Design a binder for these strands. Structure first.
Length: 1289
RNA sequence: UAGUAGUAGACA
C-alpha cells in the first residue's frame, strides 16, 4: 500500500521557445572553451608559468631528499644469512671503529658499533638465536636487539638523538624551476644515478624460455638494480623484524655484502600502533647505486676508501612495506613495458632500453613520496590534452605548476614532462622514459600509467588530507547559500523559467536549472519511453517493492553506515548490520522499502565523509549516510535504474560486458555515417556536395558535481513516462527526492580535534568553521552527495543531450548532421557529425549569406567550423540544467584514441592489468599459507583476464609465489619446508601443508585454484586402487588429517587454522541458544530468514562469527604481528585445541599419515570428491601448437564471458511454517521445487543424506575474432602464448 | 636544513 503523496502538474513548456532562444544565442560570436593545440602555445604556457612559479614559491638553494634508502653495491649480491650477518657485522664494526666521526650521526653510529663490538660471548649467543632458545641478558633483552645506555653515548650522539626527538603561516620553499643551471644539475644527478643502476655487476615454458627469459630476465639479472633490489629487500626485512612491540624500543645493528653496507636501527615507536616511524641510518662504501651525496650526513674517508653515512630516516609502515617489494614492483612494471613495446613494434626491445626502463621503474619504486605521485597523476591527463586538436591544456599546465619542486628528482621529471609535452604538441609518439618512438597513443599512455601505479595509495599526510576532504562540500554549500540568498529559495529550488532567462541571461549557471528545460528533456526521453511502456512498467514492478527491507544482503552488509548523533554531537560510525539489528530489535515486523520510508520519512538526512585512500593528487572522500537516507536513496535509485535500463545512450545501467559492445556499436555507426555524402538542396536545382566529418568530444564532469540542484530530478520524475496506471510510486519517488534536498553534514572527529588543538585560526580555517553552527554539523542543500544518484543524473544528462539534438535539428533542418551520445560513468562521449565544403565552397559561403540575409540570423555560426557551434549550443543546453562541462579535462579530437583510453580506464572490466599485477604482492589477507597463496594466484588470473600476456602473468605468479613461500618459510632450505618432516616430495605435498603451489598460469586460469590438490587426491586414489603401495598410500592420510583439523577461499580437502588478531547486539543471545537454533534450522544456511522474529537471531548469528568479525578489521598496522610471528616461526597454527607451530603440525601430520588405515568410508568419500572434481587438463594436455610464418596483428579490445540450488536444498530442509514460507518467498518458481529436488537427488544417486548435500553445495578482454565459448577463450590464450610469433592451433 | 608530510598548525 503506497500512501498518497502530492504530484506536480505539468507546465506549458514549448520547444518553440527554446528553438527561438537558441536562434538568438547563436546569432552572435560564441567563444570556444578550448584552445588549439600548438607546440608554440604549449611552450609559451610553460615559459610563462616558470616565471610565475619563481614568483609564487620562495627560492630554496638546497635540493631536498628523495631517496628513502641509500646504499651501493659493487659485487654480486648473496642473500643474507645469520652466520653471514654475524661475520659482516664484526668486519663492518672493525671498519667503522677505524674511522673518525664528524657529525652527530657519525658519532651515533660510532657509539653503536663500539657497543656492538664489545658485547660478551653470551650476548652474541642470544643476539643471533631464534626465539626458541633465546634467554634474556643484561645487554640483550630481545633477540635481534641490544641496549645502548645514555652513559655509552657521547655529547654529539645525544645531540642527534634529541634533535630527532624534538606553523600557522609559512610558504613552502621550492627550487628555481626556471633556472637552467638547476635543471642541468638535477638532470646530471638523476642521469648518474640511473646509469649506476643500469651498470652490469609445457608450451608456455618453452615460449617463456625463448622470449621472456631471453630478452628480459637474462638482461636484467646482471644489472646493478637487480642486486640493489635484493639488498633492499634484506634491509627492509631487518627493519620489519625490529618493528615489533617488544623490540622497537631497542638498538639494532645489521651488516650486508661482506660488511660493505651497515644498518643502524635506533629506538622507535612500534609499527603495530598507527602513525609510527622506524628510524635508521645506513653506512655504505661509496660506489654505484642509490647514492645522493648532497643528502648524505657525511662521507668518512680512510685511505682511498670513502664511507657514506646517511641521514636518519623515519619510514612508516606503508612506505616500508612498499620498499620491501620494490624489486618485484620494478620487475612487473618492466615486464608490462616489455609486452606493450612488443605489441606496438612487433619486435623485442633492445638490451639498453630494457635496462634503462628497469632502472627508471626501480628508482620510482624506491622513491615513494607523494610529490612524485602527484606529478605522475597530473601527467595522465596532461598527455591527452596535448595530443588532441582542442583541449584545456593551459589550465592543466597551470595546475602542474601549482606545486613546489623540492628535490632533484622532481625537477628531472618536470624537465622530461616539458620536453615530452612540447614534442607531442608539435606532431609518432615519443616515449617518456626511453629514446623509442611509438606508433600508438595507447603505448605512451600505458607507459605513464605503469609509472603512476608504482606509488602506493596512502602517501598523503593524514591531517592535511583529512582537512582537505571537507573543503569542496563546504565551499559549494556556501555557494548554494549565496545563490539562494541572491535569487530566493523558491527560484533556486524550483528553477527559473525561460522568460526569466531571456530577461536576465545570467541565470544560466551551476546550481540553477530551467523548469522548461527539465520538462522538455523529460518529453524528449518520453519520445522513446512511450513506445516501450510495457517493458518499462515490468522493469519498475520487478524491483520487488513489497519484500521485507532487511531480508536483502545489501541491507545487512558489513559496509559502514552512520548511526545516531552522540552526546558530544558527532555522528556515530557504525555498520549496516548493526543498524539493521537495532531497528529489528526496536519493532515487531519486517517492513518493506515503502513501509520503511513511511516510518522514517520525518527524520533528517545525515552524512559524514571518510578518506578513500587513493593515489591521486587529491584524495577523494567517501560519504557515509544514515538508515533513512539509505532507504530514500534506494527508492530513488531503484526507480531510476529500472527506468534507465531501457535507454540506449545511458551506459551506467549496463552490466559491463554490454557496455563495451554498446560503445563499439556507437563508434561503428558514427564511422558508417561519415562514409556517405551530404547534399544541400537549392531552389535552382543546383545541389552543393558537402563532405561529412566527425569530431569526438570526451566531455568531463557530466554526471556528478558538488555544484548541482537535486531538485531538478523532482520535475524530471514527475514528467517521466512509466507504464504504471497510477502516480503512487512516482509520487513516492518525488517525495523521497524532496526528503534528500537538505542534509546534515558532520565533520569527522579527527578534523574536529585537529582544529581544536589550534590556538589562533587563519581566515580560511575561520570561513570553513563558520559552516558548522554547533561546530559539528552544517546543512547542505541542492548538492546530493557523491555516489548516491548515478542512474538518475546519467539519465538526466542523456535527456539533456537529446534535447540539444532536437533543438539543433529544428534550427537547421537543411543540414544533415549526426549525433551520438554515450553518458558512461562520470564522463561522456559526444560525436558531432558536421559538413565541410568540398572544393573552395564557393557556393557554400554564398548559400550561408543568402540564409542570413533571408532572416535566419542563426546561420552565421554555421559558416565555418560548425562543430564548434554545435558544441557551444550543446554546452549551453547542458548548462540550462546544472551540468557544466569541465574546461580542463575535456579533449576535442578527430580520432577516438583519448576517449577510448579514458573509457577503458573507467570500465571496471578493462582496468590496466599492471594495476592488478602490482596488487598481488601487497595487501594479501594475512591468514595462512594456503589462503595467501590462493589470494595471490587469483589476482594473476584476473590480470590475464584484463589483458596480461601469459608470459607476463606467469612471471608475476612466480614472483608472488616466491614472496608467499618466503613469508611462511615453505620454500626449500628453510625449517618450515614440509619435505623435512613428511616423507614425500615437495610437489607431492598438499598445498595446505607446505607443498609446491607454483603452477602454470593456464592451469590456474582454466582449472582454477586448488587443481593441484585435486590432481594430488585423484592420483592418490589411483595409486591406492591400482598399486596399494606403502609410501604411495602415505599421501592418503595427510588429506584425512586436514579434515580432522577442519572438522575440529574454499579448500577442497581441509586446511590449517592460523591465529587472527582482532558489539552492542552481539551478546543479547546466549551462544548455546545460537548453536541450538542453528542446529534446528538448517534450511536457513542457504536462504535468509525473512520474518523479524527469527531474522534477528539470524543476524546476531551473523555477528557472532569469526569470519565476520575478522572482516570488519582488515586494514590495520597490527596485521604486521601475524607476519612477524610467521617469519619468526612462533605458535601460529591450531592443533587439538592448542596453539602450536607449523613444525608441530607437520610432525603430527607425519605421524597420522604413517598410522593411517583405510576403512572404505574414506575411500567412498574420496571417490565422491574426485567425481566432484570440465576436464580442462585433457584439453590442455591434448592440443597441437606450431608456428606459421606470419606477423602478429593486434585488433580492438573485445569483452567476452568465461564460464536455484540453495532454494531446492532449503526447500528440502524446511519443516515449520516460517521456514517453508521463507523458502517459497525466496524461490522463483515454488511449484517446481519438488520436481527440481527429485531430479537433483536422482542425478546425485546416479552420480539424500544432509551432510553430503551440505558438503557438495568472469569477463575476459580478448580480440574481436574470439567467440563466447570458454574453448574459444582458451584457444585465444594459447595462440597469444608468444609475444612476437603467430601460433596455429 | 633529521625523516615523512605540507603552501591547515602533524607525527612529537
Amino acid at each position: 500500500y503506497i500512501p498518497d503523496y502530492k504530484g506536480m502538474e505539468p507546465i506549458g513548456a514549448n520547444i518553440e521557445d527554446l528553438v527561438d532562444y537558441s536562434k538568438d544565442w547563436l546569432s552572435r560570436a560564441r567563444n570556444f572553451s578550448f584552445f588549439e593545440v600548438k607546440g608554440t602555445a604549449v611552450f609559451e604556457c610553460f615559459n610563462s608559468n616558470e616565471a610565475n612559479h619563481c614568483q609564487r614559491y620562495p627560492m630554496s638553494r638546497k635540493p631536498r631528499n628523495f631517496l628513502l634508502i641509500q646504499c651501493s653495491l659493487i659485487t654480486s649480491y648473496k642473500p643474507a644469512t645469520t652466520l653471514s650477518d654475524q661475520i659482516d657485522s664484526r668486519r663492518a664494526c672493525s671498519y667503522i671503529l677505524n674511522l673518525i666521526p664528524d657529525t652527530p650521526a657519525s658519532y651515533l653510529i660510532h657509539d653503536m658499533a663500539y657497543r656492538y663490538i664489545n658485547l660478551t660471548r653470551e650476548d652474541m649467543i642470544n643476539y643471533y638465536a631464534p626465539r626458541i632458545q633465546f634467554k634474556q641478558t643484561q645487554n640483550v633483552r630481545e633477540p635481534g636487539t641490544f641496549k645502548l645506555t645514555s652513559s655509552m653515548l657521547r655529547a654529539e650522539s645525544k645531540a642527534m638523538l634529541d634533535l630527532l626527538n624534538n606553523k600557522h603561516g609559512a610558504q613552502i620553499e621550492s627550487l628555481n624551476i626556471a633556472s637552467h643551471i638547476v635543471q642541468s644539475e638535477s638532470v646530471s644527478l638523476i642521469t648518474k644515478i640511473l646509469s649506476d643502476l643500469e651498470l652490469n655487476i609445457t608450451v608456455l615454458d618453452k615460449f617463456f624460455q625463448n622470449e621472456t627469459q631471453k630478452y628480459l630476465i637474462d638482461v636484467l639479472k646482471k644489472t646493478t638494480a637487480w642486486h640493489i633490489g635484493h639488498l633492499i629487500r634484506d634491509i627492509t626485512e631487518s627493519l620489519i623484524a625490529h618493528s615489533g612491540l617488544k623490540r622497537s624500543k631497542y638498538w639494532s645493528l645489521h651488516s650486508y655484502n661482506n660488511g660493505n653496507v651497515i644498518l643502524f636501527i635506533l629506538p622507535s615507536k612500534s609499527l603495530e600502533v598507527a602513525g609510527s616511524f622506524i628510524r635508521f641510518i645506513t653506512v655504505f662504501r661509496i660506489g654505484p647505486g642509490l647514492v645522493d651525496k648532497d643528502n648524505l650526513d657525511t662521507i668518512l674517508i680512510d685511505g682511498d676508501s670513502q664511507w657514506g653515512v646517511s641521514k636518519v630516516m623515519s619510514i612508516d609502515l606503508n612506505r616500508l612495506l612498499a620498499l620491501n617489494i620494490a624489486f618485484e614492483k620494478a620487475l612487473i612494471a618492466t615486464a608490462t613495458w616489455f609486452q606493450y613495446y612488443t605489441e606496438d613494434q612487433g619486435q623485442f626491445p633492445l638490451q639498453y632500453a630494457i635496462r634503462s626502463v628497469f632502472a627508471n621503474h626501480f628508482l620510482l619504486a624506491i622513491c615513494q613520496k607523494m610529490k612524485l605521485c602527484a606529478i605522475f597523476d597530473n601527467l595522465r591527463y596532461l598527455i591527452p590534452a596535448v595530443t588532441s586538436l582542442y583541449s584545456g591544456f593551459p589550465s592543466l599546465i597551470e595546475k602542474l605548476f601549482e606545486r613546489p619542486f623540492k628535490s632533484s628528482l622532481e625537477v628531472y621529471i618536470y624537465y622530461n614532462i616539458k620536453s615530452l609535452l612540447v614534442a607531442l604538441a608539435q606532431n609518432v609518439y615519443p616515449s617518456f622514459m626511453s629514446r623509442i618512438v611509438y606508433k600508438h597513443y595507447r603505448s605512451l599512455i600505458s607507459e605513464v600509467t605503469t609509472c603512476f601505479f608504482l606509488f602506493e595509495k596512502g602517501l598523503h599526510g593524514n591531517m592535511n588530507e583529512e582537512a582537505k576532504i571537507h573543503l569542496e562540500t563546504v565551499e559549494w554549500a556556501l555557494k548554494f547559500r549565496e545563490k539562494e540568498e541572491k535569487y530566493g529559495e523558491s527560484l533556486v529550488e524550483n528553477g527559473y523559467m525561460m522568460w526569466e532567462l531571456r530577461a536576465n541571461a545570467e541565470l544560466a549557471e551551476q546550481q540553477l536549472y530551467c523548469q522548461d528545460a527539465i520538462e522538455l528533456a523529460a518529453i524528449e526521453l518520453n519520445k522513446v519511453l512511450a513506445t516501450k511502456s510495457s517493458v518499462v512498467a515490468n522493469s519498475i514492478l520487478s524491483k520487488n517493492w513489497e519484500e521485507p527491507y532487511f531480508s536483502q544482503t545489501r541491507n545487512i552488509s558489513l559496509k559502514g553506515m552512520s548511526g545516531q548523533v552522540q552526546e558530544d554531537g558527532h555522528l556515530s560510525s557504525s555498520v549496516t548490520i548493526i543498524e539493521a539489528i537495532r531497528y529489528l530489535s526496536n519493532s515487531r515486523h519486517n517492513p518493506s522499502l515503502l513501509k520503511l520510508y513511511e516510518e522514517t520519512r520525518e527524520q533528517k538526512a545525515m552524512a559524514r565523509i571518510v578518506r578513500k585512500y587513493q593515489r591521486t593528487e587529491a584524495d577523494r572522500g567517501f560519504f557515509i549516510t544514515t538508515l533513512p537516507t539509505r532507504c530514500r536513496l534506494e527508492i530513488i535509485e531503484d526507480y531510476y535504474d529500472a527506468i534507465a535500463k531501457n535507454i540506449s545512450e545511458e551506459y551506467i545501467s549496463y552490466g559491463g560486458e554490454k557496455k563495451i559492445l554498446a560503445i563499439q556499436g556507437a563508434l561503428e555507426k558514427a564511422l558508417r555515417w561519415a562514409s556517405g555524402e551530404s547534399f544541400i538542396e537549392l531552389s535552382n536545382h543546383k545541389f552543393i556536395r558537402m563532405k561529412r566529418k566527425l569530431m569526438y568530444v570526451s566531455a568531463d564532469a557530466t554526471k556528478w558535481s558538488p555544484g548541482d540542484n537535486s531538485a531538478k530530478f523532482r520535475r524530471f520524475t514527475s514528467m517521466l513516462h512509466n507504464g504504471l496506471p497510477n502516480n503512487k510510486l512516482k509520487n513516492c519517488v518525488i517525495d523521497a527526492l524532496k526528503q534528500v534536498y537538505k542534509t546534515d553534514f558532520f565533520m569527522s572527529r579527527k578534523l574536529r580535534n585537529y582544529i581544536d588543538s589550534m590556538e589562533s585560526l587563519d581566515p580560511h580555517i575561520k570561513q570553513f568553521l563558520d559552516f558548522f553552527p554547533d561546530g559539528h554539523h552544517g546543512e547542505v542543500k541542492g548538492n546530493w552527495l557523491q555516489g548516491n544518484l548515478n542512474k538518475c543524473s546519467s539519465l538526466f544528462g542523456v535527456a539533456m543531450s537529446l534535447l540539444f539534438k532536437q533543438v539543433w535539428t529544428n534550427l537547421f533542418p537543411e543540414l544533415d548532421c549526426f549525433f551520438e551520445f554515450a553518458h558512461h560513468s562520470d564522463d561522456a562521449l559526444f560525436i558531432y557529425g558536421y559538413l565541410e565544403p568540398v572544393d573552395d565552397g564557393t557556393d557554400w559561403f554564398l548559400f550561408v549569406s543568402q540564409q542570413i540575409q533571408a532572416g535566419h540570423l542563426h546561420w552565421f555560426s554555421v559558416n565555418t567550423e560548425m562543430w564548434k557551434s554545435m558544441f557551444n549550443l550543446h554546452e549551453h543546453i547542458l548548462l540550462l540544467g546544472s551540468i557544466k562541462i569541465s574546461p580542463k579535462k575535456t579533449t576535442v579530437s578527430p580520432t577516438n584514441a583519448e576517449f577510448l583510453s579514458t573509457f577503458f580506464e573507467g570500465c571496471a572490466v578493462s582496468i590496466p592489468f599492471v594495476k592488478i599485477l602490482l596488487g598481488s604482492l601487497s595487501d594479501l589477507p594475512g591468514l595462512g599459507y594456503f589462503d595467501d597463496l590462493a589470494a595471490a594466484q587469483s589476482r594473476c588470473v584476473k590480470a590475464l583476464d584484463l589483458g596480461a600476456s601469459p608470459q607476463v602473468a606467469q612471471l608475476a605468479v612466480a614472483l608472488c609465489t616466491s614472496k608467499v613461500e618466503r613469508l611462511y618459510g615453505t620454500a626449500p632450505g628453510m625449517v618450515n619446508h614440509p619435505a623435512a618432516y613428511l616423507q614425500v616430495k615437495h610437489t607431492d605435498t598438499p598445498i595446505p601443508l607446505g607443498g609446491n603451489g607454483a603452477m602454470s598460469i593456464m592451469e590456474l586460469a582454466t582449472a582454477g585454484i586448488g587443481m593441484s590438490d585435486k590432481n594430488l587426491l585423484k592420483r592418490a586414489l589411483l595409486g591406492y586402487s591400482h598399486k596399494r603401495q606403502k609410501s604411495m598410500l602415505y599421501i592418503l592420510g595427510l588429506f584425512k588429517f586436514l579434515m580432522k583439523l577442519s572438522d575440529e577461499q574454499f579448500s577442497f580437502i581441509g586446511k590449517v587454522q592460523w591465529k587472527i588478531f582482532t558489539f552492542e547486539f552481539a551478546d543479547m543471545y546466549t551462544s548455546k541458544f545460537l548453536e541450538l537454533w542453528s542446529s534446528q534450522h538448517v534450511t536457513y544456511d542457504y536462504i535468509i530468514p525473512k520474518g523479524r522474529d527469527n531474522l534477528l537471531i539470524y543476524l546476531v548469528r551473523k555477528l557472532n562469527d569469526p569470519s565476520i568479525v575478522t572482516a570488519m578489521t582488515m586494514q590495520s598496522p597490527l596485521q604486521l604481528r601475524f607476519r612477524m610471528q610467521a617469519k619468526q616461526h612462533m605458535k601460529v597454527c591450531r592443533l587439538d585445541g592448542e596453539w602450536v607451530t607449523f613444525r608441530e603440525v607437520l610432525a603430527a601430520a607425519n605421524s597420522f599419515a604413517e598410522n593411517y588405515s583405510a576403512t572404505s568410508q574414506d575411500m567412498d568419500l574420496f571417490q565422491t570428491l574426485t567425481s566432484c572434481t570440465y576436464a580442462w587438463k585433457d584439453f590442455l594436455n591434448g592440443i597441437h601448437c606450431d608456428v606459421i610464418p606470419t606477423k602478429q596483428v593486434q585488433r580492438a579490445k573485445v569483452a567476452r564471458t568465461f564460464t536455484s540450488i540453495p532454494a531446492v536444498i532449503g526447500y528440502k530442509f524446511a519443516v515449520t511454517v516460517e521456514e517453508m514460507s521463507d523458502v517459497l518467498d525466496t524461490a522463483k518458481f515454488p511449484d517446481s521445487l519438488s520436481v527440481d529436488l527429485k531430479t537433483m537427488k536422482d542425478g546425485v544417486y546416479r552420480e539424500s543424506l544432509p551432510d553430503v548435500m551440505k558438503r557438495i553445495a568472469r569477463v575476459v578482454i580478448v580480440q574481436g575474432n574470439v567467440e563466447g565459448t570458454a574453448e574459444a577463450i582458451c584457444r585465444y590464450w594459447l595462440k597469444s602464448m608468444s609475444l612476437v610469433k603467430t601460433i596455429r592451433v
